[PDB]
């Protein structure tokens, strides 16, 4: 019966993919449920590309589920519907699995004595939500996510894979609505906490990296570049074609040079239709960045407009207006005096941490430390006798 | 001795019910990464987050020799 399914799979498979198939038959028989899970795990990770998955998964998920970890059961189903471009199919298989876990726990809980099955619940619901988003039944998806969020907080801790799957679905919905800021913020959380599963490949980094970079470019308040570099996504790869031009925009921002920025963007306006229509945003963003940085590094907390005019490479008419907007956002706060053409700040956003800036921090606290020293010794001497 | 912490608790709930398990003290001198493991064992008992009270009994601290 099952053996007939295994033979079909082997014939279509490559000689190199033969030993994975042969391991499923023997290990099942041998009742080594540890190896039954291990052999399988290797298969779904990469041979999900191949249609091999359809015949092997669904049969094994519907038959011999009880044996292996439940987590391992739902991990394969995830892999099968990744590559699936059918939504009728997707919705069917989920509803079916959910019913099976419900039964399973009646026996299993007592048998082991302890063994969670709530892992599989949440993941199922996360998958179902997502199915509805792509179908553009956005409303259903919204309320399922909300419910998951409530449930989750009752638990003190969950697996990396559980919160990575919650986050992934939520990030998808946000880029759909083109809530750029919320897409990016939730995407950061996703990277940090990431599944130890190796489903995430270099091509999957690239796909995610174009959206993350676009959201932050069109912003006027997103300054998490330092966190970005250090995260796996850009850490391992920078030397692809997507990361040639796109990363140079990114660099150009950081060095605060508008002349370079102008050169690149014109070429990118024909090629990229997102950048064609959001021209206004790209120039605003670079202006606010150089400006917030220049005041920070200076220990002086007022600088004239005219010097800011030079720094941002925009006339002085435009600088006065930009600074009115800086207050509104709350990126800077201060007061505006046009009886000397000054901006006097009282509040400046923390800039990103860099070796250079740390060095300035170290000086400042050394300097203050000498005042303290000088004073306490003078203060000791005066009125030496009374310290009762 | 895991059993003992249960037992003692039973006695003191009889003395005064307001006392409940709320965590564990360490004598220091310092916090460690073993105290993380230790925390985990008390977490099971505790229906609150286990409070780790670092009482330095030696009192080398100029101020507070107690951190929470």
């Amino acid at each position: 019966e099952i053996d007939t399914i295994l033979s079909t799979l082997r014939m279509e498979a490559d000689p190199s993919l033969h030993p994975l198939f042969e391991q499923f038959e023997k290990f099942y028989e041998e009742k080594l449920w540890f190896q039954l899970s291990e052999s399988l795990t290797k298969f779904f990770d990469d041979a999900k590309s191949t249609p091999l998955r359809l015949r092997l998964y669904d049969n094994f998920v519907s038959k011999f589920y009880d044996k292996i970890n439940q987590l391992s059961v739902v991990k394969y189903l995830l892999a099968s519907l990744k590559d699936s471009k059918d939504f009728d199919e997707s919705l069917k298989y989920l509803d079916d699995l959910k019913a099976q876990f419900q039964e399973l726990d009646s026996k299993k809980q007592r048998n082991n004595g302890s063994k969670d099955h709530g892992d599989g619940i949440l993941l199922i619901d996360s998958e179902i939500a997502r199915t509805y988003l792509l179908k553009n039944d956005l409303v259903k998806a919204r309320d399922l996510l909300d419910d998951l969020e409530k449930t989750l907080d009752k638990k003190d801790s969950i697996p990396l894979r559980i919160t990575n799957s919650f986050y992934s679905t939520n990030s998808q919905y946000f880029k759909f609505k083109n809530d750029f800021n919320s897409f990016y913020y939730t995407s950061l959380l996703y990277l940090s906490t990431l599944e130890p599963s190796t489903s995430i490949t270099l091509a999957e980094r690239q796909q995610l990296a174009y959206d993350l970079s676009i959201s932050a470019l069109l912003g006027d308040k997103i300054y998490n570049f330092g966190e970005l570099l250090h995260h796996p996504i850009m850490e391992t790869i920078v030397n692809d074609s997507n990361y040639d031009w796109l990363f140079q925009l990114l660099n150009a921002l950081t060095v605060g040079d508008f002349d370079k920025f102008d050169s690149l963007i014109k070429v990118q306006i024909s090629k990229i239709p997102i950048l064609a229509q959001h021209e206004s945003f790209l120039r605003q963003k670079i202006c606010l960045m150089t400006l917030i940085e220049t005041v920070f590094v200076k220990n002086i907390r007022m600088l004239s407009f005219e010097d800011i005019s030079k720094a941002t490479h925009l006339p002085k008419d435009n600088v006065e207006h930009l600074v009115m907007r800086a207050i509104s956002l709350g990126l800077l706060k201060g007061s505006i005096d046009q009886v000397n053409e000054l901006v006097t700040i009282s509040w400046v956003q923390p800039r990103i941490i860099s070796g250079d800036q740390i060095t300035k921090m170290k000086d400042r606290l050394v300097e203050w430390n000498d005042q303290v020293e000088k004073l306490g010794k003078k203060m000791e001497a005066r009125g030496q006798s009374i310290w009762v | 001795d895991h059993n003992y912490i249960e037992n003692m608790n039973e006695m003191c709930k009889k003395i005064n019910a307001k006392e409940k398990l709320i965590g564990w003290y360490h004598s220091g001198p310092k916090l460690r990464a073993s105290d993380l493991k230790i925390n985990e064992l008390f977490k099971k008992y505790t229906q609150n987050n286990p409070l780790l009270l670092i009482v330095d009994v030696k009192q080398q601290g100029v101020g507070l020799p107690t951190d929470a």
């Binding site: 005096d337 009886v339 | 460690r32 990464a33």
Partner: protein, 143 residues
Amino acid sequence: SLVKLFTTNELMRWPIVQKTYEPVLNEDDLAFGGEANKHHWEDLQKRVIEHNLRVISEYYSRITLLRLNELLDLTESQTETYISDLVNQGIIYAKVNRPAKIVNFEKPKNSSQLLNEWSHNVDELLEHIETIGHLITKEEIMH
């Protein structure tokens, strides 16, 4: 798009806002499409300029009167009438140099008020550095 512009503190240039929604919502029925309501589009001017006026008092402690007429996009004699109106209503408080050189947004300070803000600065610093020190201690053991 309309409603959110007017809530936000961003400067709203009057004949620009007027122009953009002019062929659509001025012609939109009863509220602006009515015969009496054709004059409720013109009166919309006051409404726009007064929200910007309010925001700018806050932001600029000192601005030249000359400049302020340009941003609100009005006749100079009119703007000044409108500065007086909002000071009279006590929404804002301002000091007007009549030849039109400077308009100074001044809310009452006293000595006590200024010193009370400074007293807090001193205390807030000492608390921040204290807290940091315990957090230095934490990271040493974690490494």
